[PDB]
Design a protein around this ligand. Sequence first.
Ligand SMILES: [Mg+2]
Ligand SMILES: [Mg+2]
Ligand SMILES: [Mg+2]
Ligand SMILES: [Mg+2]
Ligand SMILES: [Mg+2]
Length: 906
Amino acid sequence: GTVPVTWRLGVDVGERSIGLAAVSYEEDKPKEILAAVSWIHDGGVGDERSGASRLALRGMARRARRLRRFRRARLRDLDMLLSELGWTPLPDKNVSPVDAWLARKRLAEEYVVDETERRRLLGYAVSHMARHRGWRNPWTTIKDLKNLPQPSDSWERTRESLEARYSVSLEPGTVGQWAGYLLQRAPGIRLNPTQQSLSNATAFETRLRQEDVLWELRCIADVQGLPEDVVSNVIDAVFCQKRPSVPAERIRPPLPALHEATGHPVVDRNLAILRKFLSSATMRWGPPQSIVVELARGASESRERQAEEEAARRAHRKANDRIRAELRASGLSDPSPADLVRARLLELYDCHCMYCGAPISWENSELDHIVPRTDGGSNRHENLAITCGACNKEKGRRPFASWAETSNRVQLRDVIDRVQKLKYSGNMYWTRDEFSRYKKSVVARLKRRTSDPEVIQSIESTGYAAVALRDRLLSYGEKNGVAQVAVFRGGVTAEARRWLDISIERLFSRVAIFAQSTSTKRLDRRHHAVDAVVLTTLTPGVAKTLADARSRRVSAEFWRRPSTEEPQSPAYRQWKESCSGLGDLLISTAARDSIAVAAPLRLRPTGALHEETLRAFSEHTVGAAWKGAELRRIVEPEVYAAFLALTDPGGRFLKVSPSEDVLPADENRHIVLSDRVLGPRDRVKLFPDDRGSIRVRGGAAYIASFHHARVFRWGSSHSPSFALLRVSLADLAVAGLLRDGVDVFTAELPPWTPAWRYASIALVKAVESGDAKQVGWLVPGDELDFGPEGVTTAAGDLSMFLKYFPERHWVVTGFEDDKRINLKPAFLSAEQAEVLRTERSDRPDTLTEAGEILAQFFPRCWRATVAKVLCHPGLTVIRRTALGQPRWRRGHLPYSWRPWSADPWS
RNA sequence: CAAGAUCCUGGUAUGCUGGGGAGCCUGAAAAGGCUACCUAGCAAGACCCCUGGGGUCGCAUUCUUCACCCCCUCGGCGAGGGGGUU
DNA sequence: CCAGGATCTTG
DNA sequence: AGCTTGGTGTATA
DNA sequence: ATACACCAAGCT
Ligand SMILES: [Mg+2]
Ligand SMILES: [Mg+2]
Ligand SMILES: [Mg+2]
Ligand SMILES: [Mg+2]
Ligand SMILES: [Mg+2]
């Protein structure tokens, strides 16, 4: 089932996306777009709030579990040591709250002459010290902990502050003595400060160190006169700690293969999608003869570096619009970026030629650079300097600050001191960190007395993801006969599109969202696939030519500001002649909707089973009146089934409204369990809230996010009714379905699971009547194709959105209640509408009506009724292959299905 | 040539729930609250090895399970991975 | 939150 | 009654 | 710090 063709693979790697293209080639010209797909991934991020990956959250949870296990073992070993020593540990209950602290205080203060009292207090103090021992460096052993200075300087400062605050001296000032005195004198005080957030003054302000607890134990030891072997064993049992080793990590040579993971989340996401696309494309067209990849400036930078980027652009664009409005009030017709550079240099140097004195006006500017552009310089803000005209024609191609000291009319050795002693202002182009970096880089470029080479321009992407992708693609190329694999950076495909008259907005018929300036190509998510298609045309020579054109354009962007020279190469001419039909192929592919935007499905039932907060159980009387919500909150499944048989003897599911009085107060109400009998005065355990919850560890926890929704269809074949059974991981956990050999989308859920407990009442009644059967399953990230008919059940904000954005494909994002599915548009970007909200907030009247609707619509998107979505005839739930084609044949992979015509399972 | 980027390992301090209670505030028929502090647990659980106890795994690898193909590790025989075209 | 490993990949 | 929309809790450092 | 699930008044 394979025919070999000549084709090239284009890979457009992004932070949350990757664009893949298989383009057929005939005579070094594009012939047919075999495949073009944009795949959207999360970057491996599991916690969206903190940016931590799924692997990082799993590792932190695993290490917390290991910490609890070894803490249990260590406390048990201390308990055996205390039993051997005859010292009674602190009891679990029926003791005073301050017994441990007064035991520590009394043992560090006075010698106890009673034998049993001393052993009891010693056991109390030692057990409580092992429960609260403070922090130490984990790579330092017990002996080196014993050799630390005792007490630490942090506890010495804390003890001095406590002595000054409370006007009392405790001798010796140990942590147990001070905490016992504070709990006896100012009750309700809190010892350690609370992270993550009324005038309760905290007793301690620094982190407790292990040497402080060790010194307190030494003071207790030498006050009570304990034997040294006993003290050594107590220290070895309390402060024992496993060393930080490397058990889990494994931490010409062969290149890593496609199936080998690199361990970095976003790179694994991109590589998994790329290896699936490459395997499908090789099985259907044979191997490619060329593979071209680029990587964006993201996907490697940290969240801190992202915060540096947004902290740069907000201050820079505020300063540019401020002096642009000042230049518009100054009479200049066209405000321009180099005019903003010279206005910044007058905002900073206060109109001062350094080399000539002579404060100037706007006419005698004549902007010049410190380093000449032929001699390694560029149009950087550090290199640019304010001039006076007379301080412009005197440099004369010579090195800066080298001929100047060996000449008249100007002096050196005060330039560095004068720049470095200047004051950082409040609001300007640079921030507080960027102004220090600007001053240090200016001084470093002022320190030149010789050549500072050179005018380097040869860009191939060499980051971690870049080298990993090059090694794996070169391994595939050696295994499959690919002629060349080229990985670029930037920044080059935008050039290749703008010199080929390819605009995403014209290509996909996108309405204008910005009132002025150029519309962004990043609004439509298919632009990644278009850039992959364009990337198939690139060769390293023409990529270097386009980079040269971009660099000469941004060099002359400020030169002609106070342009644009076209590329001049036979390779560029041959490439532009060869890519004449690429545009016609792009409109031909876009008009027939062949380009798809898809996301991978998370089908494995792994992750957080429930929420992490334990909650208190409620109690309800058996003989009292039961409402529908109180019957829904019944914790024990046998009692739940017995009350279900009470409210309906033939029924299997609970058919209750949440607010309805289901069954009244009956005084001889008796509930017959299989092994117990519940009297009318007995108390039934209830979940605290009327939502999905499970029993974990003697408490109640809410269910986590839904793993999937099982789609049920009932009614007539021409007017069917639809509902969703939202199944979280807690339903699978309490149903015993998290074992081997279980299809989690079709395995039967018991009625007491929160899925059937909190299903819609129409669905529950139809399943009781036998009319409703499961016709499919929906996961977050499934694509709903509404067909050429589109959405016909729009109302209000969705109507106003679909007037400008007739979106046919929608992505399932969640199931926010029992009758609703949350749908976002597949082709429309997320970061574009988010930062578009930010532009409307800061800048008024800058967005067209469509842009305003997009901004006010994208946060919640289409919180859609299921009955108004699945009632569309011709709606298809599209499960793409790796090439972006909908899987329609029934196999052992998820296939596309139509909710109106899906046959029920089994 | 530093810093990071990804984890990994060992720890700490809170927080939540259950069991308690030092002080305060109510209710006094008795048991409710607040601030702290003490103590146990902190995914559900699975698999060992010996009515419990102890040891290791259990939130990653985005198409679960099933079925086919490929790669790797150990001794047909299980685990790790990978791919599956519409 | 803390220290510190191992490894890449930039140069 | 039923769909729309606004607002908020969520283990964390 | 997110975005998904839940809760609770508005329009119709
Ligand atoms: Mg404890
Ligand atoms: Mg401790
Ligand atoms: Mg792109
Ligand atoms: Mg405690
Ligand atoms: Mg446990």
